[PDB]
């Protein structure tokens, strides 16, 4: 790696507030299986029959 580890301004509760990773794995909201399930248990318009 060529970029340094930048911990020269490190200590604390607001330092976690400035913690803003630009890229990460799949977020909790992006679970379509769970979304579709809640829709099935929630009120919706008429289904096929």
């Amino acid at each position: 790696g060529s970029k340094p580890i930048d911990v020269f301004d490190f200590p604390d509760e607001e330092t976690y507030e400035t913690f803003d990773p630009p890229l990460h794995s799949t977020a909790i909201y992006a679970d379509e299986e769970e979304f579709s399930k809640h829709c099935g248990l929630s009120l919706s318009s008429t289904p096929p029959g």
């Binding site: 992006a30 579709s36 929630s42 009120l43 919706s44 318009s45």
Partner: protein, 224 residues
């Protein structure tokens, strides 16, 4: 639209005051005016208001969401064009391919809504064919909505108010610009009437009782 809801309230008060079902002769067919068929209505919807909000599809296959934070996101029927209406009404136009960073979440949630509706819900009014030039009409968004124990009430930004009854699947689409109402009966048959002609020719108790209920709901829309 406060001015459109006010006209519709007066229109409903008028027809209900004439007691259109309490008449010896009823000629409901003479109150029909096919020229007043609406362009847009809500064909599907999902109440995820516990977490995200209310998702819906319009009859042109466009999709929209009214999020709990009072913003709105509309995905046009091309599948790429997008319109975002902030809480202030501040409109903006973008594309799914643009992949906005501030809208990644809302876009993803809208796709989930779209996918559920397409794979699990029927399209209301699928037997209604589109007239020429309806593609040019400006696309409305859901201004406000609420549900009672018996119905969901959907107020569109073009002034239209739609009421879907849960148990028997009947629906009303009210258009204050034409002073007209479209009724979808239990058999899914579509019929469009002039409200002023219902006063003068009469109608069945099924439609009259729903127009009485509609007036009550329009008053509720105007309260808040």
């Amino acid at each position: 639209v406060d001015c459109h809801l006010s006209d519709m309230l007066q229109q409903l008060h008028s027809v209900n005051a004439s007691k259109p079902s309490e008449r010896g002769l009823v000629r409901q067919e003479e109150a029909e005016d096919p020229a007043c068929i609406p362009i847009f209505w809500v064909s599907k919807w999902v109440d995820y208001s516990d977490k995200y909000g209310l998702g819906y599809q319009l009859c042109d296959n466009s999709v929209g969401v009214l999020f709990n934070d009072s913003t709105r996101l509309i995905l046009y029927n091309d599948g790429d064009s997008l319109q975002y209406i902030e809480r202030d009404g501040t409109e903006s136009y973008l594309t799914v391919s643009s992949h906005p960073n501030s809208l990644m979440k809302k876009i993803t949630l809208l796709k989930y809504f779209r996918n559920y509706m397409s794979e699990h819900l029927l399209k209301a009014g699928a037997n209604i064919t589109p007239r020429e030039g309806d593609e040019l009409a400006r696309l409305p968004y859901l201004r406000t909505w609420f549900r009672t124990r018996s119905a969901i009430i959907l107020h569109l930004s073009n002034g239209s108010v739609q009421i879907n009854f849960f148990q028997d699947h009947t629906k009303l689409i009210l258009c204050p610009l034409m002073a007209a109402v479209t009724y979808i009966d239990e058999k899914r048959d579509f019929r469009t009437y002039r409200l002023s002609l219902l006063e003068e020719y009469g109608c069945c108790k099924e439609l009259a009782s729903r127009l009485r209920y509609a007036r009550t709901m329009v008053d509720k829309l105007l309260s808040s």
